[PDB]
């Protein structure tokens, strides 16, 4: 019975939330995850993925100067009110690792504009990006219109949606995302701290990774912490204040590293299992994963995890080609399949 005990998930002050393993995709807990709402700031991890992408190709770089222009003038621009701005001037020159820092650190909506001109040359073809990035990704509950998240009426995403980016963040795009861990940042003689608090939770390793709010959206964060090893995400979504969207977040994340643990079985190209093949040019077949193995399992579980496959024929037939699919590999625990990943040829076996 505790052994095999499924722990109570706490009560979160909040609209919708996910918690989910980074490395497995497994989600130990979610309410209203695919639920559409406003992602206030959210949105800017989007931005800074498309930019992360954009720096990965190799298109511009931290130190490349930006000329600040028109749109992205924070006072000429009333869109911009009451949010949190650089206070971009036209004429300016700014390195991009001071407006990506605008971006990720201090949700500067004026640096979003600056940044999306410089790298797709307008904020339409830059939003095109976005909502390609979103369907690449498979989002299915999740739309752009802006490049800040200000003055976008269709606009929404989902707590699913959003862990979803957060992924994709930490996974596509990792010098983009280690930015998020700053606590600080200094433009034009005014220090401006990271809005992401949790940063300063003794009790966690919180490392990105971002913030929101509006009156409509509620209180918004993406969150991502280490043990380990083990990395969790959380997105809340529609928390009810700044304090608030931390705490709740909080419970989530620690929750998750208390009841819950990451174990990687296999990796790409080691052997799980052998079979016989015919008319190829070797005797035997060499079985395993085409993609590393991760699963989240209950917390203590790891020795009694059992796996096993099966294949999908009778027979193994040369030619196979190398990451063929040919069978699933079954992991178990208690009796039961909890999780299965494809089994594949690991090395091409050409006709004899």
């Not at 976008?152 to 959003?162: L, P």
């Not at 980016?165 to 200094?186: C, H, M, W």
């Not at 009841?259 to 080691?270: A, S």
Request: a neutral charge; one cysteine or more.
């Amino acid at each position: 019975n505790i052994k095999t005990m499924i722990p109570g998930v706490p009560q979160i002050d909040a609209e919708s939330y996910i918690l989910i393993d980074y490395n497995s995709g497994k989600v130990l807990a979610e309410q209203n995850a695919d639920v559409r709402r406003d992602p206030a700031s959210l949105t800017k991890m989007m931005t800074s993925y498309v930019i992360g992408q954009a720096m990965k190709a190799g298109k511009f770089k931290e130190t490349d100067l930006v000329t600040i222009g028109n749109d992205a003038w924070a006072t000429g621009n009333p869109v911009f009110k009451g949010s949190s701005l650089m206070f971009l001037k036209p004429g300016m020159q700014v390195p991009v690792s001071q407006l990506i820092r605008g971006i990720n650190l201090q949700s500067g909506n004026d640096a979003c504009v600056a940044m999306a001109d410089f790298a797709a040359g307008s904020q339409d073809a830059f939003v095109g990006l976005m909502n390609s990035y979103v369907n690449a990704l498979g989002l299915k509950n999740t739309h752009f219109q802006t490049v800040h998240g200000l003055d976008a009426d269709g606009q929404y995403s989902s707590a699913r949606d959003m862990a979803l980016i957060g992924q994709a963040l930490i996974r596509d795009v990792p010098n983009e995302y280690s930015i998020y861990k700053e606590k600080e940042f200094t433009f034009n003689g005014i220090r401006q701290l990271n809005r992401n608090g949790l940063l300063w939770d003794n009790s966690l390793n919180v490392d990105g990774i971002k913030t929101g709010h509006t009156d409509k959206a509620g209180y918004n964060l993406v969150a991502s912490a280490t043990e380990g090893q083990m990395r969790l995400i959380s997105a809340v979504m529609g928390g009810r204040t700044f304090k608030g969207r931390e705490a709740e977040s909080k419970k989530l994340l620690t929750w998750g590293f208390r009841f819950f643990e990451t174990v990687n079985p296999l990796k790409v190209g080691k052997e799980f299992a052998s079979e016989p093949v015919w008319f190829g040019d070797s005797d035997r077949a060499s079985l395993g994963v085409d993609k590393d193995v991760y699963l989240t399992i209950p917390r203590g579980r790891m020795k009694d995890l059992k796996a096993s496959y099966v294949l999908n024929s009778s027979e193994l037939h040369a030619p196979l080609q190398k990451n063929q699919v040919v069978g699933t590999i079954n992991f178990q625990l208690d009796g039961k399949t909890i999780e299965q990943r494809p089994l594949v040829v690991l090395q091409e076996i050409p006709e004899g």
